[PDB]
Design a protein around this ligand. Structure first.
Ligand SMILES: O=C(O)CSc1nc(-c2ccccc2)cc(=O)[nH]1
Ligand SMILES: O=C(O)CSc1nc(-c2ccccc2)cc(=O)[nH]1
Ligand SMILES: [Cl-]
Ligand SMILES: [Mn+2]
Ligand SMILES: [Zn+2]
Ligand SMILES: [Zn+2]
Length: 455
């Protein structure tokens, strides 16, 4: 037997009452789902968002994909397809590949065959797909405000499970952040075809993700719990070390296709599911996942960050620093933005932010004491949030600075974070300046505002 399917991941069928609040529901299932990394959610029977589109007016630029196990690919990027011409190409591909009608090809068989073809470099199957944020050429699958909407479209505008709303809801910790992240708060649209595949990965900053399949043939998933992320990476490192070489930026991270049986052989727990149209898949923090499409389909996905995630978010940026990997945003900047809005925060959010802020302040206090002992004496307040992100990365570890950094007039524009004072230039430390966003005396009242809000 060449492929043994992993065990099924948890499937939840919440009542209307349980379903109404996505954040409460996710918190409820967390003790179960965090052990499997992914889970599937079937909405109540009458939660049925309307899907309507003109398949001739939606168009997109396709990406192309070779399907070889262990071969390097990248997450970020030909004549356009319309949704109709992509669909015709996709249906004909599958139909011809199997010499069968597409909805007569068993899901078990497509899966078995996927793992055969990626392992056999004699086969050079290539497929195409779409992947992008919503645009005027190809918009969200959920209702958004703008056009006169139907009554049914209007009902789902404000849904918690409308993925456009998820990040700006009250229990989301990104609800009041000002920085423009196209990646972390905007949904991505994915147009799939048979065998088009997403390589093993975790989300930026170890966030959650929620993924909805609007219509079409199923999407097959493999997931690994967060506690096993480093085991998985060690397996990857032994079998494909090329994927771990340092890359110039975040538009360059390498990822790959790998058979889940190979992971399971090395004691990594893996779970599977077939996500059908109308179902959600949720991925938990640091939970590795991968998969492929059974045929022509359309999915929508978004990152999100709950209060549960906050401490993991801090750990992630620490992990990025040790690896010299670029950040998408400054975690500390997000924390201080929320503290500056303490009076309008949800009170549980306020309570959790306060705890992370206390850790941030004590770490910052110790770091500033250490660089003072290195002989850095001069200092000046600096509004880091005003710099383009690529103008405030630590020269050494690439972390996005916000709380503080060291500069030297010798190297105009260059910064190091306070872990890397010795990595900036050859000048003696008294030539350096500590650039800081806030004094410790600024920070304690900000934290107290959170405590008062949390009561
Ligand atoms: O049965 C379901 O799919 C959801 S409820 C539930 N699932 C699980 C579970 C399901 C699949 C894989 C691992 C655990 C454990 C548990 O205690 N409860
Ligand atoms: O990437 C996830 O976890 C969302 S599921 C999904 N992703 C992709 C994808 C993701 C990133 C870059 C390219 C494709 C394609 C697809 O058909 N599905
Ligand atoms: Cl192949
Ligand atoms: Mn993902
Ligand atoms: Zn650094
Ligand atoms: Zn210098």
């Amino acid at each position: 037997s060449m492929f043994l399917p992993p065990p099924e991941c948890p499937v939840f069928e919440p009542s209307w009452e349980e379903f109404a609040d996505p954040f409460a529901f996710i918190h409820k299932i967390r003790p179960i789902a965090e052990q499997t990394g992914i889970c599937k959610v079937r909405p109540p029977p009458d939660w049925q968002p309307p899907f309507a589109c003109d398949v001739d007016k939606l168009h997109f630029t396709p990406r192309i994909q070779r399907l070889n196990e262990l071969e390097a690919q990248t997450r970020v990027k030909a004549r356009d397809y319309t949704l109709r011409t992509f669909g015709e190409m996709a249906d004909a591909f599958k139909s011809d590949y199997f010499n069968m009608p597409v909805h007569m090809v068993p899901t078990e068989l497509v899966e078995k065959e996927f793992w055969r073809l990626v392992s056999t470099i004699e086969e050079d199957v290539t497929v195409e797909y779409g992947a992008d944020i919503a645009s005027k050429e190809f918009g969200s699958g959920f209702p958004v405000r703008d056009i006169k909407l139907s009554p049914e479209e209007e009902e789902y505008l404000d849904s918690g499970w409308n993925l456009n709303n998820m990040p700006v809801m009250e229990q989301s910790v990104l609800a009041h952040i000002t920085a423009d992240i196209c990646g972390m708060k905007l949904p991505w649209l994915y147009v799939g075809m048979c065998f088009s595949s997403f390589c093993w990965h975790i989300e930026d900053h170890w966030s959650y993700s929620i993924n909805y399949l609007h219509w079409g043939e199923p999407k097959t998933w493999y997931g690994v719990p967060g506690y096993a992320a480093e085991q998985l990476e060690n397996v990857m490192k032994k079998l494909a070390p090329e994927l771990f070489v340092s890359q110039p930026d975040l538009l360059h991270q390498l990822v790959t296709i790998m058979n889940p049986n190979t992971l399971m052989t090395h004691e990594v727990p893996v779970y599977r599911t077939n996500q059908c149209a109308g179902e959600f898949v949720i991925t938990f923090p640091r939970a590795y996942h991968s998969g492929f499409n059974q045929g022509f389909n359309f999915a929508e996905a978004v990152n999100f960050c709950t209060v549960d995630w906050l401490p993991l978010g801090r750990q992630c940026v620490e992990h990025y620093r040790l690896l010299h990997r670029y950040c998408v945003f400054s975690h500390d900047e997000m924390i201080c933005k929320m503290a500056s809005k303490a009076d309008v925060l949800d009170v549980v959010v306020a309570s959790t932010v306060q705890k992370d802020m206390a850790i941030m302040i004590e770490d910052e206090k110790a770091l500033r004491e250490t660089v003072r002992k290195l002989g850095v004496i001069d200092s000046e307040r600096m509004d880091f949030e005003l710099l383009p992100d690529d103008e405030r990365q630590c020269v050494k570890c690439k972390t996005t600075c916000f709380m503080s950094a060291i500069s030297c007039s010798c190297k105009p524009g260059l910064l190091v974070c306070l872990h890397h004072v010795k990595e900036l230039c050859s000048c003696p430390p008294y030539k350096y300046k500590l650039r800081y966003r806030y004094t410790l005396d600024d920070l304690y009242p900000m934290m107290n505002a959170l405590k008062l809000r949390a009561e």
